[PDB]
Write an enzyme that holds these catalytic residues in place. Sequence first.
Site, mmCIF file in Angstrom:
data_model
loop_
_atom_site.group_PDB
_atom_site.id
_atom_site.type_symbol
_atom_site.label_atom_id
_atom_site.label_comp_id
_atom_site.label_asym_id
_atom_site.label_seq_id
_atom_site.Cartn_x
_atom_site.Cartn_y
_atom_site.Cartn_z
ATOM 1 C CG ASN C 375 -0.316 0.064 2.703
ATOM 2 O OD1 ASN C 375 0.667 -0.475 2.768
ATOM 3 N ND2 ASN C 375 -0.783 1.211 3.343
ATOM 4 C CB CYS C 377 1.707 3.200 4.902
ATOM 5 S SG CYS C 377 0.737 4.746 4.911
ATOM 6 C CD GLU C 379 -0.216 -0.453 6.423
ATOM 7 O OE1 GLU C 379 -0.662 -1.352 6.742
ATOM 8 O OE2 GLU C 379 -0.770 0.682 5.841
#
Lengths: 287, 287, 683, 683, 86
Positions: C375, C377, C379
């Site tokens: 994603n 981020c 994660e």
Amino acid sequence: DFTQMFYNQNVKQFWLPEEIALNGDLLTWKYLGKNEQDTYMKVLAGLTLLDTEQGNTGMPIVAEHVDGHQRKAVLNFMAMMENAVHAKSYSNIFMTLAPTETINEVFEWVKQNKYLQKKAQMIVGLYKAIQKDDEISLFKAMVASVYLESFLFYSGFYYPLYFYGQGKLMQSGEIINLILRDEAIHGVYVGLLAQEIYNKQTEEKKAELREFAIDLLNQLYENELEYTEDLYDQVGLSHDVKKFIRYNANKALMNLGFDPYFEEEDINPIVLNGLTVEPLKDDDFYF
Amino acid sequence: DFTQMFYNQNVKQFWLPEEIALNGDLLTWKYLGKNEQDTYMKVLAGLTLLDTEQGNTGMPIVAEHVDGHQRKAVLNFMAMMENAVHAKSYSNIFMTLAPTETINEVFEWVKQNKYLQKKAQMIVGLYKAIQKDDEISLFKAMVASVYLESFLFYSGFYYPLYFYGQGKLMQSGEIINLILRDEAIHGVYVGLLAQEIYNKQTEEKKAELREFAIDLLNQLYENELEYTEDLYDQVGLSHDVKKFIRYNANKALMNLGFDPYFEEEDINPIVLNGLTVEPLKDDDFYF
Amino acid sequence: VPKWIQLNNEIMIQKDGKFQFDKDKEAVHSYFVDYINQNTVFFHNLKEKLDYLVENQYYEEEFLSLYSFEDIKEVFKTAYAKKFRFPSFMSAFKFYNDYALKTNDKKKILERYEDRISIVALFFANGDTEKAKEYVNLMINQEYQPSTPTFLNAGRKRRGELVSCFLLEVNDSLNDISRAIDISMQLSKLGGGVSLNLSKLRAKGEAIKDVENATKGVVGVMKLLDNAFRYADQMGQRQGSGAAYLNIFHRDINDFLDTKKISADEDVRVKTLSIGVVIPDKFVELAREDKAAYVFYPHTIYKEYGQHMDEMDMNEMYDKFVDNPRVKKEKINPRKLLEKLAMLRSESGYPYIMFQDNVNKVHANNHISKVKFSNLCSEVLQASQVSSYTDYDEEDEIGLDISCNLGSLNILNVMEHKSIEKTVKLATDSLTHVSETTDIRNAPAVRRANKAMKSIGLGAMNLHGYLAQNGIAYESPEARDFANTFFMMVNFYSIQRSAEIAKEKGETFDQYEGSTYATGEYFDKYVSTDFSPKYEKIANLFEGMHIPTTEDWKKLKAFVAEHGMYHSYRLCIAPTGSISYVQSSTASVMPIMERIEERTYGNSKTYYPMPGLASNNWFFYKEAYDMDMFKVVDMIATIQQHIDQGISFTLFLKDTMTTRDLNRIDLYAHHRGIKTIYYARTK
Amino acid sequence: VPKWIQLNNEIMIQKDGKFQFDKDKEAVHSYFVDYINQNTVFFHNLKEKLDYLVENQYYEEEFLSLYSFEDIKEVFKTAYAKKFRFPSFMSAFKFYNDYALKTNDKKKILERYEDRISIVALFFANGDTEKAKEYVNLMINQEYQPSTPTFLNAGRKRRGELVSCFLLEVNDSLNDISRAIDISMQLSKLGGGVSLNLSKLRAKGEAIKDVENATKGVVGVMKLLDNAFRYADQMGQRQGSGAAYLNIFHRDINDFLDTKKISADEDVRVKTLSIGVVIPDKFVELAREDKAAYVFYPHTIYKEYGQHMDEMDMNEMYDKFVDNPRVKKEKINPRKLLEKLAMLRSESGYPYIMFQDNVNKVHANNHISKVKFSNLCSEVLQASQVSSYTDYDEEDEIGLDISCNLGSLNILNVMEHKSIEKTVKLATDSLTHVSETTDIRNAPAVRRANKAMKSIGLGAMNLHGYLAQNGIAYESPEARDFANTFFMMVNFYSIQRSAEIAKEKGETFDQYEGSTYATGEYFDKYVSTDFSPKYEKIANLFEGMHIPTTEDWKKLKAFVAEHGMYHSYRLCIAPTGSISYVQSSTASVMPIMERIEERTYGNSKTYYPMPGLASNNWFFYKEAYDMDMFKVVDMIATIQQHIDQGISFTLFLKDTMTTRDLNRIDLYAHHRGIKTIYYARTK
Amino acid sequence: VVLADFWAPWCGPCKMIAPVLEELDQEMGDKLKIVKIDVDENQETAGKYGVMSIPTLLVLKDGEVVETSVGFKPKEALQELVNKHL
Ligand SMILES: [Mg+2]
Ligand SMILES: [Mg+2]
Ligand SMILES: [Mn+2]
Ligand SMILES: [Mn+2]
Ligand SMILES: [Mn+2]
Ligand SMILES: [Mn+2]
């Protein structure tokens, strides 16, 4: 860290007055009222007079006291632009719009004007007070220079930009925009030279230099408000010009590495329209 | 009667070294002997020093003392050319042809070379001796400046011209020719200002000023001979260069309104080959 | 200057050589008394407040209708029964500036902390008063923090979606690219970050229907997506953040990486597109052996084999691609490419390094799909299927696009309450509710994957804060032991709650039978290895709590085999950089960047000391930049073995370290089993 | 240098004070003999050539299967029986560099002129041998020229679309904007230029779902469209060209124009997106009286009145908008905006000026919709209905989007053969076939409007060439009289052919009954005014051809009333660019820019005198910049009254003429009934 | 009299002070004890003394902190700092 970069930006911005044909301004100039023509003339003379001080004294005096061959070269280039390009450009605008007798009278008036004189002499006073091998006096003069380049010119620039943003006096407005673009980079550059001196000082000396800068800004700002009303009340613009002065005062402070003094304000939209590689050596894939 | 035409000529001659691509000289440089490359580097380094001081000190200080905004604009422009254009161009040449260590070494060599230090001491000393409102000290510095522009550069200019004339190092040579074209007009202009001051004097005072000019020329000349031998003996050209500097000494004297001092000699022919927005109205909406 | 800010400014004014940390409580008290209470509109009773908020389009009337007013009143009372007091000024400031409901003119505060928590709890429970009070106790104790979209938008009418992130698979067609742009703009309108997989897009200079050397590569798609995210930037509340992920064996990998170069021209430079690079183990093998590597043209592979390049196993198919004359490729130096990656991370923090084989070696849903990208981020590591969007009036083959519903456990508050099991189960239930109530009509694949996969993200935070407040150094082996035990318990209870939900609802996530949960391969290391603390100091932290043993893990494995698993993915540790302030917690499981954060909000600086920072634990709150990055990698790999999805692992580097040090940290992370690397922060 | 290029350079080598114009024919002979005849693939017979071209996927098989090989051979013999010879080297160079079919390696040439013409004719006829021979005679006589897409791609497998234009209505929604981007890319990959009406998009600072100051205006949509057209750059062989049109009363009109300023920053500037401004008569009235004007926010008007701003007559509703407090607007200066338009056109040639009331005063299909915008060439003016593209798995409301079925009459060759009627009817049939065979699946509104409106564009070219080669000055009243008679004849026979097609097929265009053709209002000026030439010299040009009279127009009106009209639109004068060389014609009805064109090709300098240029007619071929723009406006308005759509009217300006002169030309064009103004070419 | 050095292996200034403390031990090690404590391994002591920053040098006399010096110091400055308490 910065002089060669500014050298590049300065020399690539080189221009000459002859490049812009001025005569087509007479087609909008003739349609302005007497107060508009009067304000424009007075503003123009104000800018001319201040810029002459910068060309004859401000830039050359700073170039004289700053150490470093490359800095002296950039500063020389800036002084050249004041004297050889900007001064001729202002003269050209005047000669296009007014007859000789009118130019002489406007300059007589602006030369005697209390608010123009107050700021002109305040700045010149600080340039005259620089002492050989005294970086404190040099810094104070640099602050004065940044205030002229990035702040004091803008009560004047407002009007040509205001017309330029409306489709009026487009040729002289283009010239003014080029001049203003030079003064912006001059202000940023001299600002970096001032920060260099500031950063060499003790904490007590820094606080003292900050007080100097803010006190000077306050004196100039209060006179700018009076200067502004004196010129712009007759054309109803003073409120908006005052917002533009504060916005540019904040830019001048930021050039000197200081925090903004004034709250953020929106600007007149017409004026806005005018404006270490290290190679992988193996044994690093094994742990 | 002349400043405006010099202003126009100076600004129309404006250039930057980056306009000339230098990678074309790479092969003719590679092919020169070690002696030839050494002399070439040192020659340009001596030129760099002269332009550094002419830009930092000589032209700005003369600008400060000469009256009239247009005269000051010309002198300011010439100052900018010295350090922002000329002195920098030599570094463009060095950075193309030579590795950093050779560049570092040649700049160290200028600092310790006794003839180059002596000539800088003498010229800059006269610049710094100018006293405000004292036309005689100003004249003396203008003589020094003419001697730098029209005489002292030429022990250096000889070698790039000598190569250019043989079809070697022609890109570097193009830069040097542009520099030389500038210095020729700089020497004439400063010469005319010097003559203005000289012409104000009594016959007795004039006689002393001629003595000053000739004594200074001879002192600089004797030093330049030693400098020339030091640089050119290793390439076999010292006698030829000496003839060239005498030729140019006469041109410097002539720029000052004085008779030639050295007898005419044949210069190497190679070196000679080296030389609108109209608004709408109510009547445009009906046809 | 405001009084609360001036009192907060007194933190760094050292008296007797010590920081005035007690001034922060004074700062928060001044903040409340002088701004929050004065600027909070008060109603004669809760009925008037709820009526005003529902009628003025502040709250949805649907979610409040399942409860009688007495139930809502008692939920609010049990929210205020805690009498929650913010411990720091920055917590209250962040909450009442970012999440507290304000009037349409943004002049008065409509929601307290206990009202936001009560509304979110009532949304979560969905008609259950006891469950609503359980959620209220969970959040007011600050044991569990719903993600920023969920906490901010639960029960509100002027809301986007409750999903924090979206992952889109972009197929190799103009229809699919245009639909990907459309879906990216639609989901950015909803407020969630969008990550796109560009590894299926064919390379630059490829053929478009017998027209050779016509493609612009993935970089043209990056420009399109960048302008789409700039356009759909949530009107300027927060700039539209998007992510583009490309496999390192894609031909455009150098062009993909050059978008983040400062020297790159504006015609090839993206500004709102975060870039991530997917590194299979084959690339690391080639770089280690210094052999010259080949990046491939995806369309040639698709024509030759019928499958996209990222859909096949790189470790197996690399030699076949190289020996295939019909597969076009260009020669690259894998070690030079690694050095370019390191220098790009040093200069800009990009790309997001994703180790594909580190993800898929322990990925439970490899039968559905391999995890081809992460994603925004880095994660969310979930299986995704590409959607074949056909022409107009032609039915589209809708695949699975990852939607991630995030939630964070406050490790300090979870451990101090000795409530790992209850917090994890309640958080799993809340995330399940968020996933169920979330529908997205303009993204068919996101909606389909939300309905089928039912994947949730249960993160954790305040790891470093808990360790430092317990006298444990983040790099110490005791800290890694605590992380191992705590996250093993978190995984145990998340799996148990997922199986209980699957039993209660009688349904598991789609294609559960092919997952390692059904076959029992997921529980092998849990029924073989005991994850109880090895240090008596760490074991004393889990006192009063039942640590899942090997027998308990065997029982859980049997229970999962019998009843299934409701969620395909349950655990994912997001950075949680914004809600960390409100919960008085350190961001994520990352070590703290600064002991006392310096923040400027307006013309006044606002210092934020770390949660629980004091004189006795000053050196336990070691700044992340001063820490050995190898020890941080060891910590994250200890945590990662109990997290089915990824962890937002940020690398905190000093300016003294070179690109070789960054490459060494990257390779150590790859060797230790790190799945993704988020950022390379330089000090 | 090549022999033919060297011979072409002897045109400017002046001997005896005269240009060596006869050297051009020698240039054609040298070019052919030394390059073409050597590098054209020759087959033993036409059968082998056809088999090679169909088998190697150069030609489509479906259109050739409608004919027996005897019919195809007879058609090709008819093409070669004319023994067509290019009269200028530039004509052959253009054809054999752009439109002649080449091998996949581009080394050789597969198609001659008589081969491309034969293939296009066989495509047009659709199984009819006599019709194919008629088309061959029409094109080899160079009486009619199919548009560049149609001429290039007719009967070829490796192609795009035969449609030249795509006019898209963009509704005020994110889904509609995303679909606009998708359709723009899907139609740019087909080759045709795409124009978009952005007047329905709400302005900057408007609300998105009751949150205020949320929109970034139409400038963001222009950014998206510009990058979409850059991405769909058609290999880069021809850059993706797209237009954006905005009503001058749209609030974003100033920012719409600000994107074409040279001083504009890269954060606002669009490069590949041409811009056009739609000016209703109300704006011209406001500018005339020097009264303050108002630019309105479209979404406020839509909320207040339930209708879009551009669907309402501004001449009637401007006052209603102004005195409406619920309609948002800001005061502007209409004369300042006109001066801004003039200076923008002087600096960059943009925007295209569309006088909406001039278009809609004589628009036949106002019942379907008023003409809100024009195409990329600023000459197509057709009714369009916006499409409400809804969320996924929801049915979309499909509107009408305009498409170019273009073809040009060579006025010189049309009137030399005295076949205005036959040429117009055959061209109408060919354009009808092109419209019918066009089936675009990724643009729903374009396909629906192509099926319903059945609109075609029949332009004319070589007007200045014919006038100068017949001793008529372009600005002379005799030229305007000839244009009046010729284009009245063209309109008469186009209407007659449309009615004949409607009779033979039994169907008209959709919503024909509401058009002025059915009511007879269109034929009022044709049954009330005689358009026969008023000059004896002009009347002699039409000798041997039956000029339609008032009674003939009455019979045509009765025929249309009884039988209907198949095409909603029939005539539109395109710029006729690179294909004008092949036809040896001047571009469009525009005057010639230069007497001898100086063109650079590779390392060679090529010269192209305008066709028929010589010593006797040197001053008749007056350069366009030397002409009085007012008399050119008179000429176009004389032509415009017989063209139901617009004319691509380019303004040719001298350097000395200011912005006031450009504004005077624009206002005289508006006063004379000019519908659109294409370009401001400054010399 | 004890000079306690609070240091870490990653601290650049702490590496610079190490040779200065070795010279100081050679000159003064009969009257001064030098103690080094690694703050990465010994957080409780660094917390007890309120150590903020490294290197931090504490002069202790008979268990009490009598002087505190933060950052790098040359030998002569450390000798002056310790000699006040001998
Ligand atoms: Mg495809
Ligand atoms: Mg909508
Ligand atoms: Mn200036
Ligand atoms: Mn300046
Ligand atoms: Mn010089
Ligand atoms: Mn000079």
